């Protein structure tokens, strides 16, 4: 068994803009195999009923899925994605930045 | 359209 | 420009928790137009395009049905790859395929696809020709007699080069005012001081449809592939994609640093600086 780590990217759909509604995505790229756990976080604690897209994957094989939700981003707030998988001693935590 | 498959 | 179609299907057998889940995906280049899921509750509420929705329902039934099948073909497929390998029937397996069909700006075919992966590992392709399989080991040679004696690359063959094709050409004019739009990269670059020193500049791409992009940093027009940092090309969830590039400069020397863009719905390339 072959087992590939995900590559995590988080962002926003539209350029943040503080009190203007958004989408955040975290996008979970390159693993193997497909299992995997995805959360968002705001200010630590997990945000109910985001979405995911259907499973796929790129053309070497590995699987790929964006979660995503509603979002307004303010100063105050902190936004995250929190991701598991079997190549992961421990859940993977990757910060929203704006600049990235 | 979908593709009928084979079993390998 | 030039089109694809593709389905992407994952079946992954689950000891313990039911039979194998099946999702089979299809798309016309980056855009998504239909999903079966094995998985799902309600078949019927599952996505299709709005420009499926057009073909009518005997067309729905017809799709539905094969995938019906085709879940049950793929877990056919898992009992017997599990054999193939002396595999226990204590662990979990992933057969993965791709298949459909590339064509022109004109609409003739340039190739078809249909192959597979277990565990993710290459198994069995067919090969351009349409004809001929290419087996990665002694087990896919196990498929490819079975496929041989069956006369399996016929049927495929008839599909990529008849089926596919018109399909795809039906469904670009149907949706032409999406999938036959390419939309632009919007571009910028910006500046992150990291020290007295140096600092990254990262160029952006947002916006833009279909993925495929280039996004490159010269330094006095050479390429700096090595010390260019470059994401993943990433979903933004409106059926356009983002992707950057970025490189750490020394402080001072930014204006030596120039970014590069191709993309389908530029009418030129862009060459870009900070400021």
């Given at each position: 068994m072959i087992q590939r780590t995900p590559k995590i990217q988080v962002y926003s759909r539209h350029?943040?803009?503080?009190?203007?509604?958004?989408?955040?995505?975290?996008?979970?790229?390159?693993?193997?195999?497909?299992?995997?756990?995805?959360?968002?976080?705001?200010?630590?604690?997990?945000?109910?009923?985001?979405?995911?897209?259907?499973?796929?994957?790129?053309?070497?094989?590995?699987?790929?899925?964006?979660?995503?939700?509603?979002?307004?981003?303010?100063?105050?707030?902190?936004?995250?994605?929190?991701?598991?998988?079997?190549?992961?001693?421990?859940?993977?935590?990757?910060?929203?930045?704006?600049?990235? | 359209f979908v593709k009928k498959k084979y079993c390998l | 420009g030039s089109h694809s179609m593709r389905y992407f299907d994952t079946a992954m057998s689950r000891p313990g928790r039911?039979?194998?889940?099946?999702?089979?995906?299809?798309?016309?280049?980056?855009?998504?137009?239909?999903?079966?899921?094995?998985?799902?509750?309600s078949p019927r509420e599952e996505p299709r395009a709005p420009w499926i929705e057009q073909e009518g329902p005997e067309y729905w039934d017809?799709?539905?049905?094969?995938?019906?099948?085709?879940?049950?073909?793929?877990?056919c497929s898992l009992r017997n790859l599990r054999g193939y390998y002396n595999q226990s029937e204590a662990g979990s397996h992933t057969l993965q395929s791709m298949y459909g069909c590339d064509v022109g700006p004109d609409g003739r075919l340039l190739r078809g696809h249909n192959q597979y992966a277990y565990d993710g590992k290459d198994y069995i392709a067919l090969n351009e020709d349409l004809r001929s399989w290419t087996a990665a080991d002694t087990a896919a040679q196990i498929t490819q007699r079975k496929w041989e004696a069956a006369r399996v690359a016929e049927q495929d063959r008839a599909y990529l080069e008849g089926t596919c094709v018109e399909w795809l050409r039906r469904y670009l004019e149907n949706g032409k005012d999406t999938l036959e739009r390419a939309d632009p990269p919007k571009t910028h670059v910006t500046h992150h001081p990291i020290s007295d020193h140096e600092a990254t500049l990262r160029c952006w791409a947002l916006g833009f449809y279909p993925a495929e992009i280039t996004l490159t940093w010269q330094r006095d027009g050479e390429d700096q592939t090595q010390d260019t940092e470059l994401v993943e090309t990433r979903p933004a969830g409106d059926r356009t994609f983002q992707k950057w590039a970025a490189v750490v400069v020394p402080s001072g020397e930014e204006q030596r640093y120039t970014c590069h863009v191709q993309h389908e719905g530029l009418p030129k390339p862009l060459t870009l600086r900070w400021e």
């Open positions: 350029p943040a803009e503080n009190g203007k509604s958004n989408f955040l995505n975290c996008y979970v790229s390159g693993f193997h195999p497909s299992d995997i756990e995805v959360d968002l976080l705001k200010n630590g604690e997990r945000i109910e009923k985001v979405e995911h897209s259907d499973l796929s994957f790129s053309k070497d094989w590995s699987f790929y899925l964006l979660y995503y939700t509603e979002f307004t981003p303010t100063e105050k707030d902190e936004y995250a994605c929190r991701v598991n998988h079997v190549t992961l001693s421990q859940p993977k935590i990757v910060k929203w930045d704006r600049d990235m | - | 039911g039979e194998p889940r099946f999702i089979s995906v299809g798309y016309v280049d980056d855009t998504q137009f239909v999903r079966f899921d094995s998985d799902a509750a017809r799709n539905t049905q094969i995938f019906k099948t085709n879940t049950q073909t793929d877990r």
